[PDB]
Amino acid sequence: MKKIEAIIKPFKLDEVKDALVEIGIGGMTVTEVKGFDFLPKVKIEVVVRDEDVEKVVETIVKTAQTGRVGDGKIFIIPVEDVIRIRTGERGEQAI
Amino acid sequence: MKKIEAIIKPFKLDEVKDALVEIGIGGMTVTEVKGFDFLPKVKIEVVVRDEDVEKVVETIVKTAQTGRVGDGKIFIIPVEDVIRIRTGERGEQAI
Amino acid sequence: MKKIEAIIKPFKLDEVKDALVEIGIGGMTVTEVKGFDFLPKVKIEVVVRDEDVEKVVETIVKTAQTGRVGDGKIFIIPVEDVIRIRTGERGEQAI
Ligand SMILES: [Cl-]
Structure with a gap:
């Protein structure tokens, strides 16, 4: 298994979340973060089977x-x- | 060593934090996050020796x-x- | 490559951020977190080549x-x- 951590623009959150749910992602964790001045970003974390990473x-x-x-x-x-x-x-069994 | 990252319900934070301190956890990092609509959750991170993970x-x-x-x-x-x-x-030496 | 995750005191954020930019760090993610009562801290994440870690x-x-x-x-x-x-x-190519 692998944890996939993506840092994206805040406005893209709903689209990425929906696209991920479409391909079968069971759960995800989102955190408000800042990055690059510091700009607001959104961090998404999902943990999936090795074969689902790509x-x-x-x-x-x-x-x-x-x-x-x-x-x-x-x-x-x-x-x-x-x-779980x-x-x-x-x-x-815990995804 | 291993990092243990747990995503829990906000209200369980004080109980889990206390239980971890009881078993000898020296430090921990907590982040407010959202997950699954997005519901509020609490992320706890502790890094411990391999033998203390279980x-x-x-x-x-x-x-x-x-x-x-x-x-x-x-x-x-x-x-x-x-x-450290x-x-x-x-x-x-840095735990 | 390695992800470097540092939990620091909030007031040290600008100094550490500047020092890291000086040594060539291209990007970083910062999160407001709490740790040890729970005290406010700042989490910095940078991902770099193995040879740049030290x-x-x-x-x-x-x-x-x-x-x-x-x-x-x-x-x-x-x-x-x-x-990227x-x-x-x-x-x-994605740093
Ligand atoms: Cl991680």
Whole structure:
């Protein structure tokens, strides 16, 4: 599994969120952040199976790219385990 | 060492924080975030020795689980080094 | 590449940000967080080439260290890929 962390322009949040839900993303975490003066951005984090990473990356790029400066970046970070707090299920069972 | 990132319901913050302090957690970072409409959640991050990961995971699960939807998830991410800014100490010496 | 995540005192933000820009950091993400009562802190994230990690760590330590309690910590986390949303460039080309 991998954590996908994307820093995007605030106004692109609803479009990226919808596009991700369309391709089957079960959950996501959003944080208000600042970046580059410091400009407001939105950080999205989703953790997915290794085999779903590329589709997610493509979708975020297609949806948030405007062609102008400050569109953001996407980081792929390794995740060694995921645990669902409600059930205690782990790994694939916890998504 | 591993970074443990848990996304929980806001109201469970004081209980999880206390339970973690009880099992010896020296420090933690908390961020206000939104997730799943977007609902408010609390993100907790602690970085601990490999041998302390499971105890921390169990404690968070026991403390934040309500059995209802949206209890959250816990991600275990690898950390290659930790540096204490005040002293410059690293690794085990920086916790 | 590696993600460098540093939790610092709020007042040190402008100095650390400037010092990092001086050593060639192209971008950074800042989040308002709380840590240790919970005290306000600032989280900085930069993702850099493996060979630039130590210089960045040194710079953050030199700039944010006051010698007092609560100066913070720096975590080095592995990043398997970086994608620039504006162009779709990856890895070294996406910084
Ligand atoms: Cl991370």
